[PDB]
Amino acid sequence: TETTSFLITKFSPDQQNLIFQGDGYTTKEKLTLTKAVKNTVGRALYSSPIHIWDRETGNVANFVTSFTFVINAPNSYNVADGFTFFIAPVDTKPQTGGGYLGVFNSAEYDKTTQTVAVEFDTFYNAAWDPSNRDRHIGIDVNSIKSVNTKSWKLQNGEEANVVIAFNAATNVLTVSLTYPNTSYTLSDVVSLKDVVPEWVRIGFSATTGAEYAAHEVLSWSFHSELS
Amino acid sequence: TETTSFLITKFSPDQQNLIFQGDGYTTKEKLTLTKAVKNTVGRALYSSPIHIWDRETGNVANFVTSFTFVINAPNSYNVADGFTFFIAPVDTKPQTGGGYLGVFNSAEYDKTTQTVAVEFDTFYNAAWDPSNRDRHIGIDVNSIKSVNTKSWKLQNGEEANVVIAFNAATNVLTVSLTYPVTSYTLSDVVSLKDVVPEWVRIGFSATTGAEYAAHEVLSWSFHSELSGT
Ligand SMILES: OC[C@H]1O[C@H](Oc2c[nH]c3ccc(Br)c(Cl)c23)[C@@H](O)[C@@H](O)[C@@H]1O
Ligand SMILES: OC[C@H]1O[C@H](Oc2c[nH]c3ccc(Br)c(Cl)c23)[C@@H](O)[C@@H](O)[C@@H]1O
């Protein structure tokens, strides 16, 4: 058995178990991935590599992460681009900004990205986003074009409680988002061992483009178990 | 409802609803995929594209195929490489030979291959095959390294009756082989709609490598039903 777990109830100014990229930084109880400014990207990774699957045994990890995030849009109707929770190679680095959310580079499947992300997408990108043009939760596998999405009403400035669980027996990745004032779930079968390397880093990403909003994380826990 | 169905109880020398690739051809009322010769490949596809899933609806077809095959190994202990029933893009062509069975090119997941195969694998390839080194039935998804396998004792020269069924309610692919030891069954979830295009061709592949055997099919039926709701 190999397990990794952590809990951050409130971020500190020197959150040394996080790796920051782009504009990500911790400040005043919060993890800020971006401020409400154009054309930016912020990411933060958990410091330790996580052992998500093993090939000798072929086993995959069960894991769960929960976190509370806030999107603060100065202009409530012009919100972009969103935020994600992601699983990527250990040396992951920010990818394209804007509608690509800092985690992918194309709406086509790219095996070299080796990334699974759960996106909370505030801006309709016509080339790939769901044609109903709603903001949406999505599950992304090596592409910005989600393999499954669920429409989602953003509550500007409200705390969103997210739980993301992966069941290694069924390859099922479940997402839930809850506001204090409304609940959304979304699941899909994800063959993690075919997507991400055996070791990964996990983290958050958020971006802005021509439209913008602040993206913040208030707390984060994670637990994986690999038999 | 969109359905594709066909039955061939015995192959004819001019089987025009099959597309042949490599060494495949029909003779003496059988489909021959390879003769007992080294380093070859032979495939046969049903002619018509088959509508296996639909994006607008998200629906996946239920389907069942059943066929009888024979492996005739001149050398009973040195058998290779095996045979498959496969689902692939409409323009599918033979892929790597030998232990790759003419359907895959790697033991790592390859999205672009877009192929599901059910393998009847007679030769232990150390780089990916089950480490007990048994001959084995396998379910292969974009890789020659099966997502799931079941040890299978080959009966040389004997007719093997195969049924492959896909339950679209559960995305469960089930394989059964029966020799009329005597029966083997293997199941796994296959997310077809993530792997193959909406339109597919189905067919058989067989290969030999440094070791060899004849791989033959004696009959084939298929039926898929894709719901429109
Ligand atoms: O922030 C939302 C969007 O901003 C940009 O797209 C544009 C939306 N309106 C525009 C107007 C002009 C120009 Br130039 C651009 Cl790139 C855009 C791009 O960065 C997109 O990737 C992003 O989704
Ligand atoms: O037909 C069975 C096998 O034949 C070849 O592997 C070998 C089996 N015995 C050998 C002996 C020598 C050499 Br060189 C090779 Cl490549 C082989 C290769 O073509 C394998 O891919 C295949 O599974």
Ligand SMILES: [Ca+2]
């Ligand atoms: Ca978007």
Ligand SMILES: [Ca+2]
């Ligand atoms: Ca083999």
Ligand SMILES: [Mn+2]
């Ligand atoms: Mn999206």
Ligand SMILES: [Mn+2]
């Ligand atoms: Mn095999």
